Specification:
monomer, 452 residues, 3 domains, 22 strands, binds calcium ion, binds sodium ion, Lys-gingipain catalytic subunit, hydrolase, cysteine peptidase
Length: 452
């Protein structure tokens, strides 16, 4: 089925292809430095490079060739980061959606399944790009002064006379029954299933790790309960950045005449989101229901975990896979595809969904699930020069990275016994202070330095 054939794309060593507008070279530096420090092998290119070009066709040909060349060397990019708005990386009109899509940058071979996890850091200025980066770095380096906002979520089944009872409430109730609850570490699960919605967006300010809205949308708003781009600019969640998902129409229509809701929620300074998942064209009630809960869900009936396939919520909470922002959207699209394949009621089709949904902001973030755990590690007093690998003790599954000045020298994943073989692609030949970073899904990062 679609789950066996097109599972989670995340793989190690992490490799990322970055295609960016030339005006963003300087602003990108801190984000690229941190991604290298945490173990990403980066291949960074700008549209002022003739090999890349500035057109939809040239950029796409460039990305497809980088993917195929990478694959040929068993070094395929895992992520594709598009940096800029449509004035620098246009996207193209969806064959099914008739609206802008980034799908065809990521879809290299003949089907509609992406080869890479693609996200767009959409900004109209270097300042707006830095706003996104600063939120991402605080979240991923876990430098926020109050981590307790991570134990809280906001879930809204918005207004619709026919579908709030049929799909909105069953979706949110499924999320709360199995995952967004005290058993999973969540202390505050703000949820609005029906009117009155009074005060539902105050929680965005007081602090949430995650905000999910399912109902009507517009290019610049969650329609009812209303949250406009003007209200997003007035948010006050300093040091409390979240992932937001709009399972609604057109909030991620990023070629719109005005910055769309997804663009504003990620671009706003020291408030809003570090990432947004939403749809460029209309989304449909049927497919959105499967997207969140899984296929085999029935309208107007609260779905069970055993009675449905894997949806976006289910994937999010698997401990060992689907641990990135992009993988949450990937799992949702898989469930909407599976529902069509097995003959559930569908309203639009799988191809349309793969063209529709987008990540705005940083899709490579690994979101925490309530309070992240403290990792266990042992770092040596020093690192001897000219070694093919180092053995570093860390909890099983931890990703260890050694770097200096934003240049990644080596990576390794801790084995079952808690030992990582850090394979050095660049051997340490000069004395100095080298960065050691240890990450693991739903664990606080370990950020240290070792002398050589
Ligand atoms: N290990 C702590 C983490 C925590 C939760 N809230 C604050 N701190 C307990 O649980
Ligand atoms: C966007 C909207 O008004 C509806 N046409 C679709 C909403 C689907 C919500 N999950
Ligand atoms: Ca493909
Ligand atoms: Ca735009
Ligand atoms: Na509680
Ligand atoms: Na499910
Ligand atoms: Na997961
Ligand atoms: Ni707590």
């Amino acid at each position: 089925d679609v789950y066996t054939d097109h599972g989670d794309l995340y793989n190690t060593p992490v490799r990322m292809l970055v295609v960016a507008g030339a005006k963003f070279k300087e602003a990108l530096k801190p984000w690229l430095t941190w991604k290298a420090q945490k173990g990403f092998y980066l291949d960074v290119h700008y549209t002022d490079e003739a090999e890349v070009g500035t057109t939809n066709a040239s950029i796409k040909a460039f990305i497809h060739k980088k993917y195929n060349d990478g694959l040929a060397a068993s070094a395929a990019p895992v992520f594709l980061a598009l940096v800029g708005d449509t004035d620098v990386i246009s996207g193209e009109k969806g064959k099914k959606t008739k609206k802008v899509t980034d799908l065809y940058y990521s879809a290299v071979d003949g089907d509609y399944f992406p080869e890479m996890y693609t996200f767009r850091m959409s900004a109209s200025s270097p300042e707006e790009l830095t706003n996104i980066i600063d939120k991402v770095l605080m979240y991923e380096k876990a430098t926020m002064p109050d981590k307790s906002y991570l134990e809280k979520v906001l879930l809204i089944a918005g207004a619709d006379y026919s579908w709030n009872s049929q799909v909105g409430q069953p979706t949110i109730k499924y999320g709360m029954q199995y995952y967004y609850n005290q058993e999973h570490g969540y202390t505050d699960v703000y949820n609005y299933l029906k009117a009155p919605y009074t005060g539902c967006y105050s929680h965005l300010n007081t602090g949430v790790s995650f905000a999910n809205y399912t109902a009507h949308g517009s290019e610049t708003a969650w329609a009812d309960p209303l949250l406009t781009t003007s209200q997003l600019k007035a948010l006050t969640n300093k040091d409390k950045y979240f992932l937001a998902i709009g399972n609604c129409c057109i909030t991620a229509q990023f070629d719109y005449v005005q910055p769309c809701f997804g663009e504003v929620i990620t671009r706003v300074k020291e408030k809003g989101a570090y990432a947004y998942i939403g749809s460029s064209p209309n989304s449909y009630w049927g497919e959105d229901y499967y997207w969140s809960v899984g296929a085999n869900a029935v309208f107007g009936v609260q779905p069970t975990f055993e009675g449905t396939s894997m949806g976006s919520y289910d994937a999010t909470f698997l401990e060992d896979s689907y641990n990135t922002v992009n993988s949450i959207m990937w799992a949702g699209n898989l469930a909407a595809t599976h529902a069509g394949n097995i003959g559930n009621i569908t309203h639009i089709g799988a191809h349309y969904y793969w063209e529709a949904y987008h990540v705005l902001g940083d899709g490579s973030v690994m979101p925490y699930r309530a309070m992240p755990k403290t990792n266990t590690y042992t770092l040596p007093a020093s690192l001897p020069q000219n070694q093919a690998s180092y053995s570093i003790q860390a909890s099983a599954g931890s990703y260890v990275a050694i770097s200096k000045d934003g240049v990644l020298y080596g990576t390794g994943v801790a084995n079952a016994s808690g030992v990582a073989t850090v394979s050095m692609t660049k051997q340490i030949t000069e004395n100095g202070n080298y960065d050691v970073v240890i990450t693991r899904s739903n664990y606080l990062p370990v950020i240290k330095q070792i002398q050589v």
